Amino acid sequence: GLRHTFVVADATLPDCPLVYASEGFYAMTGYGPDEVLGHNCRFLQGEGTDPKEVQKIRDAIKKGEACSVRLLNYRKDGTPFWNLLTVTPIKTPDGRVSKFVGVQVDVTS
Ligand SMILES: Cc1cc2nc3c(=O)[nH]c(=O)nc-3n(C[C@H](O)[C@H](O)[C@H](O)COP(=O)(O)O)c2cc1C
CATH of the domain at 25: 3.30.450.20
| Contact residues of ligand 1, CB 6 A cut-off | 7, 9, 16, 40-42, 44-45, 54, 57-58, 61, 71, 73, 83, 85, 87, 100-102, 104
Method used experimentally: X-ray
Would the CA dihedral through 96, 19, 22, 55 be positive or negative?
A: positive
DSSP 3-state of 19: strand
CB 101 within 8 A of CB 20: no
* Separation CA 95–CA 55 (nearest Å): 24
* Separation CA 83–CA 94 (nearest Å): 32
Please tell me the distance between residue 85's alpha carbon and the centre of ligand 1 in angstroms.
9
To what resolution in angstroms was this structure determined? 1.9
Into how many domains does the chain fold?
Answer: 1
Give the residue from 85, 62, 66, 69 showing the smallest Cα distance to 14: 62
**Which residues sit opposite 97 in a β-bridge?**
91
For the chain, what percentages of helix, strand and coil (3-state, to nearest 5) are there? 25, 35, 40
Q: Which residue type is seen at 106?
A: D
Residue 83 annotated as lining a ligand binding site = yes
Residues spanned by the domain of 78: 5-106
CB 56 within 8 A of CB 69: yes
